[PDB]
């Protein structure tokens, strides 16, 4: 009904919040992973995400930008943009709403194919 | 003295002085590293030959004007392969710009004297 709230924080407080401060906010590995940093491969993601939001219509998902980093935390910088996460074979299309922060993009394209035992 | 000019050009090749192709020649003329330039003629180059001629006339560039391109290429002797015989199929070169570290030679001096005459 309302705006979301992490511990004492609203999403708007999350969005207009610095990264290291946001680190202290969310979880140890995740705050650490921001403290450690994004490489080239992840930066091209951020720019290509901005261009997709520029080209995107209002009532439409932004265009997909692919990244193989399945091992990658979806940050609020990233929020509101499509990213094609690589499985190895294919790129899975993910729109990243604000609750996605602190999760992997790899999460949304499962590596093992989920099991069904009695198939034949 | 074409045999002497051939020996001088070969010694310049030995010492690695010569700065060649029209473009590197234009560079060497601009840098003012040309002591003599030579240009091919009797070739459909109405603008090219006119440009390089005015470029040499611009500031302190001596100009030899050899006739054929195939002949200039066989003289300079770039892709001489199968030296036990003739060069198999010369491709015609247009321009050569000599830069001369090894100026101390009797053939070079006799050329400077011929130019004096």
């Amino acid at each position: 009904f309302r705006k979301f709230t992490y511990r004492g924080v609203d999403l708007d407080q999350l969005l207009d919040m610095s990264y290291e401060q946001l680190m202290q906010l969310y979880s140890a590995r995740q705050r650490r992973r921001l403290s450690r940093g994004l490489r080239r491969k992840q930066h091209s993601l951020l720019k290509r995400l901005r261009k997709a939001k520029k080209e995107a219509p209002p009532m439409e998902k932004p265009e997909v930008v692919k990244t193989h980093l399945r091992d990658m935390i979806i940050l609020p910088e990233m929020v509101g943009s499509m990213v094609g996460v690589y499985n190895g074979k294919t790129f899975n299309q993910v729109e990243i709403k604000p609750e996605m922060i602190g999760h992997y993009l790899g999460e949304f394209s499962i590596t093992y194919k989920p099991v069904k035992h009695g198939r034949p | 003295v074409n045999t002497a000019l051939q020996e001088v050009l070969k010694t310049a090749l030995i010492h690695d002085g010569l700065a060649r192709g029209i473009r590197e020649a234009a560079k060497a003329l601009d840098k003012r590293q040309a002591h003599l330039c030579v240009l091919a003629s009797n070739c459909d180059e109405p603008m090219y030959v006119k440009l390089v001629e005015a470029l040499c006339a611009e500031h302190q560039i001596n100009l030899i004007k050899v006739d054929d391109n195939k002949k200039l290429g066989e003289w300079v002797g770039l892709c001489k392969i199968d030296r036990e015989g003739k060069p198999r199929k010369v491709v015609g070169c247009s321009c050569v710009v000599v830069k001369d570290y090894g100026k101390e030679s009797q053939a070079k001096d006799v050329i400077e004297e011929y130019f004096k005459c």
């Binding site: - | 473009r23 560079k27 601009d30 840098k31 603008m47 090219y48 440009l51 001629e53 005015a54 611009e58």
Partner: protein
């Protein structure tokens, strides 16, 4: 085996016979006037031309661009 894509072609480089000819500008008098910018580098004090793109300048052997 049948391919989806046609094979890709090698980039045919836009060859011009005596391309250096269009670099300098001819005159009935004995001169040359290097119009477009000249590089201030020591290897080409002046003569060598820069690329003239539709939008902004650029230099070839050393690879350098200047946007609008």
């Amino acid at each position: 085996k049948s391919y989806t894509t046609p094979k890709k072609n090698k980039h045919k480089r836009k060859k011009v016979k005596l391309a250096v000819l269009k670099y300098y500008k001819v005159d009935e008098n004995g001169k040359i006037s290097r119009l477009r910018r000249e590089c201030p580098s020591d290897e080409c004090g002046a003569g060598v031309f820069m690329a003239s793109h539709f939008d902004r300048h650029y230099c070839g052997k050393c690879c350098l661009t200047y946007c609008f």
